[PDB]
Amino acid sequence: FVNQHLCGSHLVEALYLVCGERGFFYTPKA
Amino acid sequence: GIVEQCCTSICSLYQLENYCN
């Protein structure tokens, strides 16, 4: 589910699943 | 940024993990 175009809520969900308890940061305007 | 690497182009686990804390 990681190797594709991930945008918006779809990208946020991938980060949630991959990072787990470590958490993550989402910066659209980077 | 993350959008350019994963949204506009195909993502990868390597890149996603760069954004974990």
Residue B13 contacts residue A2 (beta carbons within 8 Å)? yes
What the block records as the tokens of B19 is 């954004």
How was this structure obtained?
X-ray
Q: Report how far residue B13's alpha carbon sits from residue A21's, in angstroms, rounded to the nearest whole number.
A: 16
Residue B3 contacts residue A28 (beta carbons within 8 Å)? yes
Residue B6 contacts residue A6 (beta carbons within 8 Å)? yes
Tell me which chain B residues have a C-beta less than 8 angstroms from the C-beta of A21.
none
What the block records as the tokens of B8 is 């506009």
Q: Report how far residue B8's alpha carbon sits from residue A22's, in angstroms, rounded to the nearest whole number.
A: 25
Q: Per the CB < 8 Å rule, is B2 touching A24?
A: no
Tell me which chain B residues have a C-beta less than 8 angstroms from the C-beta of A22.
20-21
Q: Per the CB < 8 Å rule, is B21 touching A11?
A: no
- Which residues, other chains included, contact B1 with Cβ-Cβ below 8 Å and sequence gap of 6+? A27, A28, A29, A30
Residue A28 contacts residue B4 (beta carbons within 8 Å)? no
Q: Give the Å distances, CA to CA, from A3 to B7, B15.
A: 11, 10
Helix then strand then coil, in percent of chain A rounded to 5, is 45, 5, 50
Boundaries of every domain in chain A: 1-30
